[PDB]
A paper describes a structure:
BIC, a second-generation INSTI, lacks the oxadiazole substituent and features an extended scaffold that allows it to span the IN active site. The interaction with Y149 (Y143 in HIV), which is an important contributor to the binding of RAL, is largely absent. Because second-generation INSTIs do not form strong contacts with Y143 in HIV-1 IN, these compounds can be used to treat HIV-1 infections that involve viruses that carry resistance mutations at this position. This suggests that if an HTLV RAL-resistant Y149 mutant arose, it is very likely that the mutant would be sensitive to BIC. The position of BIC within the binding pocket brings the terminal heterocycle into proximity with the IN/CCD β4-α2 where it has close interactions with the backbone atoms of residues N123 and G124. The corresponding residues of the HIV-1 and SIVrcm INs (N117 and G118) were recently also reported to play a role in the binding of second-generation INSTIs to the primate lentiviral intasomes. The complex of BIC with the deltaretroviral intasome shows that there are similar interactions with the backbone of the IN β4–α2 linker. Although bictegravir (BIC) is only about twofold more efficient in blocking HTLV-1 integrase strand transfer in vitro, BIC potently blocks HTLV-1 transmission in tissue culture, exhibiting a 20-fold improvement in EC50 (0.3 ± 0.173 nM)9 compared with RAL. For now, BIC appears to be the more favourable HTLV drug candidate, however, there are no data available yet on either the pharmacokinetics of BIC during pregnancy or the safety and efficacy of using BIC in pregnant women with HIV.
Integration of a DNA copy of the viral genome is an essential step in the replication of all retroviruses. The target of the INSTIs is the IN active site engaged with viral DNA (vDNA) ends in the context of the nucleoprotein complex termed the intasome. As in most transposases, the catalytic site is defined by the Asp-Asp-Glu catalytic triad (D65, D122 and E158 in HTLV and STLV INs), which coordinates two catalytically essential Mg2+ ions. The STLV-1 intasome:INSTI structures showed, as we previously reported, a twofold symmetric IN dimer of dimers with the two B56γ molecules that laterally flank the intasome.
Numbering used by the authors:
A (entry chain C), F (entry chain F): 27 to 112, 124 to 333
B (entry chain A), E (entry chain D): 3 to 39, 52 to 148, 157 to 280
C (entry chain B), D (entry chain E): 3 to 280
Write the structure that this text describes.
DNA sequence: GAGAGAAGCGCCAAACACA
DNA sequence: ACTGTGTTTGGCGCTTCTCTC
DNA sequence: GAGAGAAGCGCCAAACACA
DNA sequence: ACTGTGTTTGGCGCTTCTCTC
């Protein structure tokens, strides 16, 4: 078409929408490496021009712009996942996906964005379809997804408890129904960032959360791939209230592997961190059982 | 040029993929070269590991003081001719300058790290030091890179090779798991906390009066919002089409017109 | 007549006004005078600003400074990132092309790989070895106007800050080794001290996300030229020279022909506006 | 703790703030630091102004300047009236007390008899002959702070103006005699050129009616003293010295004891505020 | 001290009366000293008279170039060793510097004032020069004063005596008729013209913002009227009781508050 | 009493008036040189304090201040003249008179002075009594009187034609009735300053003035004591209109002394000035009679 | 019970030195 | 291309504090 | 006949040099 | 007492001018 900055402002938003519509068409690298090369080049150039334009002007976002860009995002990212294959493979269409992720990130964090316009454009279904994408094997996709989900959770207020219920449900499914998952670490980092912003006094459903989906989660045989982040979550929560540390102690004293295995050391690490905080406030109620358990 | 970059740097094939070359060309270059053919810490700069390694040369010995971050694998190496406590303190200070001040440090026992001088140095920096007696992979890859560089040319002052090797390990090579370089993973900003029952308001930057450089005017033209700010300059869109970096000496703080 | 009075005594403007002359006519006599403009050291020309990079690791700036400590004169090679102000400094015994190359490689290992770097016309920046090292990494090394230290203001100011911190450290513990003091000062500058205006440390700006793209630039300059009184930057003179006509002028300086054989580049600080001969 | 961090690295204010400290506490740490204040060359002290007479022929100001012409180095003795700016200049071959006395007598014959005159501590103003000549006419001759040319700004600026006019005259006619050029320049300055601000020539102000009386003055000064970091005017030093307590301070300078034997007078430009030891 | 003033100066008794001494003391001092015991021009600097006089010494001769104003008797004298046209031009320029540029000049014929050089010098200054061939009293009093000064002391460089004599004639001695000194009469401002059918309005001076010196303040305190203005300072009454000379660097122009 | 600046502003004008009243008492030096020495010293100090105070403050002159100071002036200056005695003698009480003259000069030229308040305080009688003082033999008194009369004439508008008639009458008396006068030069300087401010076209009474009191005035035997100033007046008037020069020519050709005398040269001087202006505009109507007259 | 002094804190223009 | 810049510092307006009639 | 360009003129803050 | 200051200069607001639809 034409460059977005070489048009008069009267119809500048019109060409904005039209060029947004240009990238709505799909391009699959998995089907064959060489297919519509110049179309793909035009799409990449258009995406670069859009992402450079969005971050250099003010009063750009307007009422009829909020749907379609998300729809464009909805066209490209939300799709059937590639078949599982257990160095992990890299997604074939990474360039276009990376540009789209960057453009969406800039679209959401722009100072002109109003959190009261997308309330009837972004709903629970969007969050479900986005969270189902966290199963992706690509680590770069996981990084961009987590850094986008953090902003989405922070900006909106009516979409918080629903995400909490959804993460509880997916944790229950992961720990009970299906053990195949690859995005434990990123979600744990987001959860830790959420935990850091709690206030006093701590509410009861936080206690239920930690007792149900945090402490039992240690039983997973694949803990080593996400050992630090999960631990940090615990090291992030207990500082709000030190009275609730004892149930964590009985949980870690029961989930400890009673047989010799290389997995022991990681447990010690978490205990060490807990120890480094458990010494003050005269916490010796469960010191003797803990010492007896670690003696064996 | 990926070919010359690999000739001088001898970095990994993935690093070549992040450049202009693609997977097939990166593999072809990698296999055509004659020479090339868990985590304990929770956060960056939280727990370190300090090793001392002996580098063997044809006619002399070198001492490599290496500090490795346990969360990202960042390496800080210093070359010395002897080994005492003073040089241990010097290497620690250089590592702090390159990376930052860690909260916890860990190293093996020996003549160094056990004297009163090292404990005094760690006390003033509020660094708690623990000793254990029995990573070793970063050391090995460092020795291999140094050997490759010396094989490429024997006429090096032993300083340029070390500096290049550190640059390659930290800035050029990319980790296989997280697809991030060691510098990128170590220095990636963390996720800010999310306050509860309070919306995360967007940060608003102040407005500025600006003057166009090279015009010798004495007029400040309009209070206007700044897109980005840097050291010695700030982005001001002079019109509705273009933006320019204006130095701080030509910018004055203002108030929102309301 | 104001004309003969000014040609005899070179009086002021109001002195011609009280003898009978309009303000514009007296002003025209003053600006049309040839001796009255070369002898007046007062001028008013636009100010220049050093070129700044569009993103981290775009443009660097380097210099060499001397430091006296324990009867030894150490030479500090200082490199500063133009975008964020991050400083990488290495202390050496002498000045040599090998020392400059080693300092540049250490700066690369500490901060990153820059595209363009500019320094003054020092004795060690113009050697064959330094140029070969720069072109091996595809780094464009440029030069400044000779004997014009103002064009490298950022790096000289960084040298002053570093020296001030070193003197502060040596005032308390005179027995502190040089390397310890330099490492502590570098850590304090890069990671602890915050910039005055943006209220962000150099380290946050250097490793801020590189997501913002590079704004497009326009190389279009002025198509006109004027007449300028010029002074040679190397040697200071009491009176202006010329006037002459600039072959071409850019932002911050102008190409002034010193003689009939070769031209030269003169900054805007040593140029004065002239009257049109035609 | 901000205290140990600043005692180790000497960081800034916000660097202490982000580690946990109120703004006032960090500011107190910064101003209570001993090394952080002697090494910083930045200070903020009130400016001084030369003493000005209350009426014409009250206070004069003199200096000696060099001029190169026809391979000869003439010495211009310049006297300026402080109230009106009237200039009397005499050109001589060498510098001697007799030359200074003759120049002063010529200035008296040209302008009038002054009461107080102040010059720098030149080699010819401190001789017995000059003092005897001054006391013969009941003229009080004072001296300035040594190696501080700023205290005689008016006369040095007048020297610059006179030299600029002489250079303008010699640019047109290089064969013009020195005495003719000096006479023409003196006439132009005193009778033709108008002052920038009051828009009146020096000659009108000098011979304006002396009807306005002399306003009464008050010699009452501040009764308090403070602690000052000081620098010797003669030799420039990188860092401040002291701090010490001033014996007595006046408007424009202060009496600072350099050593335990004798004190000295230090202008406000080389003094820095200190913290109270008690 | 009138006694020492007369000892050095040998001025008239009336000049002593203008000082602390009164008529009786002035007469007593005058008679106790051993050594002391029409107008053609219309305005000052309108018509001059130029004479050349020979001063006789014990072993040499001096040339005195004297220019006398015909309206006030102001004297400008220059001492020379020879007599040519160039020194005539130099003496004329010195007289212009001391007194100003006259409109008409008059002198006797001779080797000087008749050459092309003197006419060229007078033409550039817009001075018309007329010659007549036949004041003489100012010359005589100048010679008498010089003789008295040399009698008081023979060790004078012939320059200090001349400078003192000019000072005494112009600034110290007072005319008998108008009771004014020659400098006072020559440089007395003239009466400004009075426009007809228009009232002579009082000149109004601008207002100023001022800062008190020696306080390092950054505030300008009130637009206020200036009583008097001079070179490098101006009178500003800081309160309703006192006034102070404020330098121009601490003053800013303002507008009447109305 | 007390210093004028050491009193509160509420009654500052009261002490101003009181200290003005203090100098109303007379002190005569002619009667005896030594009489009330300390009273005279207090009077001199008070006068100096008043003259320094008046020129350092604003908004000082007030409605009840205008009379009395003039009355104080009226007390001191307007008096019987000393007996005539034909180096002229100096007035005995010069210090006090000089201070009073300076104070009156500063009082009239102060920027706070309003020319509409003294209109019913300064009348024709004041101008008569001031002009009768110009006969004083003291030259300093004449100088101060002329520099005061200039300002008085310039400031007021309704007192101009009356002064013109009075100067015409006194000129008639001087040239016809009584030949004893000493203030010719100062009045001529004031008249020349007035002439410099005329406009075009010149009015008829100016022609009558020059023809009646200016040209015949040359017949005075004592012309030499005021030769320049009078001449300047002529050299000041004719530039407004060059048509009226011829009657001046016939006047100077008739008042020329037909016999040899030293008085000739001064006449030539005036003619020279007239010549220096009469050459342009083709003025040769009376050139031949003038040449014939000067030939003899 | 309430309003004037007192401690806190963000901002800035003139100075200084980098050979 | 070519081109001066960042930190220190008392004074001051705006704001939030508490001892006193 | 009328309102937008064009010449006139008073003012000022940043620069410079006085060894 | 002791103590930095006066001139030059393009840019710009305010004002008074005249050629043009
Ligand atoms: O004058 C200098 N600094 C002081 C200063 C400033 F820092 C900033 C300003 F705005 C003004 C200043 F007066 C200065 C001088 N030289 C060099 C510098 O880098 C330098 O900063 C340098 O490298 N060379 C080499 C190239 C030829 C040889 C060697 O001499 C020159 C000397
Ligand atoms: O530095 C001088 N001028 C430049 C300047 C200025 F003018 C005004 C400023 F604000 C700053 C400046 F840098 C200067 C130096 N000296 C003398 C001067 O009069 C003088 O002006 C002088 O007479 N002596 C004698 C007493 C001891 C010997 C002889 O050295 C000093 C040297
Ligand atoms: Mg430098
Ligand atoms: Mg000097
Ligand atoms: Zn290789
Ligand atoms: Zn000129
Ligand atoms: Zn400190
Ligand atoms: Zn005598």
């Amino acid at each position: 078409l034409l460059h977005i900055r070489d048009v008069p402002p009267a119809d500048q938003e019109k060409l904005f929408i039209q060029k947004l519509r240009q990238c709505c068409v799909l391009f699959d690298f998995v089907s064959d490496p060489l297919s519509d090369l110049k179309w793909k080049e035009v799409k990449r150039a258009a995406l670069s021009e859009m992402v450079e334009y969005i971050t250099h002007n003010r009063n750009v976002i307007t009422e009829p712009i909020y749907p379609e860009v998300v729809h464009m995002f909805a066209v490209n990212m939300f799709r059937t996942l590639p078949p599982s294959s257990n160095e992990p493979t890299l997604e074939a269409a990474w360039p276009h996906l990376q540009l789209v992720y960057e453009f969406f990130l800039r679209f959401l964090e722009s100072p002109d964005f109003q959190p009261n316009i997308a309330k009837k454009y972004i709903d629970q279904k969007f969050v479900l379809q986005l969270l189902e994408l966290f199963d992706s094997e690509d680590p770069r996709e996981r990084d961009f997804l987590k850094t986008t989900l953090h902003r989405i959770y922070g900006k909106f207020l009516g979409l918080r408890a629903y995400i909490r219920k959804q993460i509880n449900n997916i944790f229950y499914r992961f720990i009970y129904e299906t053990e195949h998952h690859n995005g434990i670490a990123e979600l744990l980092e987001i959860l830790g960032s959420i935990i850091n912003g709690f206030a006093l006094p701590l509410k009861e459903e936080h206690k239920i959360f930690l007792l149900k989906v945090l402490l039992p989660l240690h039983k997973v045989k694949s803990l080593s791939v996400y050992h630090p982040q999960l631990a940090y979550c615990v090291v992030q929560f207990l500082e709000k209230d030190s009275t609730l540390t004892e149930p964590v102690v009985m949980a870690l004293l029961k989930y400890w592997p009673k047989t010799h295995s290389p997995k022991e050391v990681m447990f010690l690490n978490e205990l060490e961190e807990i120890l480094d905080v458990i010494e003050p406030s005269e916490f010796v109620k469960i010191m003797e059982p803990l010492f007896r358990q670690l003696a064996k | 040029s990926p070919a010359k970059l690999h000739s001088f740097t001898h970095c990994g094939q993935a690093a070549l993929t992040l450049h202009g070359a693609t997977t097939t060309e990166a593999l072809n270059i990698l296999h055509s070269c004659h020479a090339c053919r868990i985590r304990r810490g929770l956060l960056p700069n939280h727990i370190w590991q300090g090793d001392i390694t002996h580098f063997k040369y044809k006619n002399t010995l070198y001492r490599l003081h290496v500090w490795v971050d346990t969360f990202s694998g960042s390496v800080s190496a210093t070359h010395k001719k002897r080994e005492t406590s003073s040089e241990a303190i010097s290497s620690l200070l250089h590592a702090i300058a390159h990376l930052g001040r860690p909260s916890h440090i860990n190293t093996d026992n020996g003549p160094a790290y056990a004297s009163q001088e090292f404990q005094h140095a760690c006390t003033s920096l509020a660094i708690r030091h623990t000793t254990h007696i029995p990573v070793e992979r970063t050391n090995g890859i460092l020795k291999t890179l140094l050997y490759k560089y010396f094989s490429d040319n024997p006429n090096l002052p032993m300083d340029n090779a070390l500096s290049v090797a550190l640059w390659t390990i930290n800035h050029l090579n990319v980790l296989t798991h997280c697809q991030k370089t060691r510098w990128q993973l170590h220095h990636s900003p963390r996720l800010p906390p999310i306050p509860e029952e309070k919306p995360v308001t967007t940060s608003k930057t102040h407005w500025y009066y600006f003057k166009i450089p090279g015009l010798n005017s004495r007029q400040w033209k309009g209070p206007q919002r700044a897109l980005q700010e840097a050291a010695g300059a700030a982005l001001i869109p002079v019109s509705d089409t273009a933006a320019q970096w204006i130095p701080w000496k030509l910018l004055k703080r203002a108030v929102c017109p309301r």
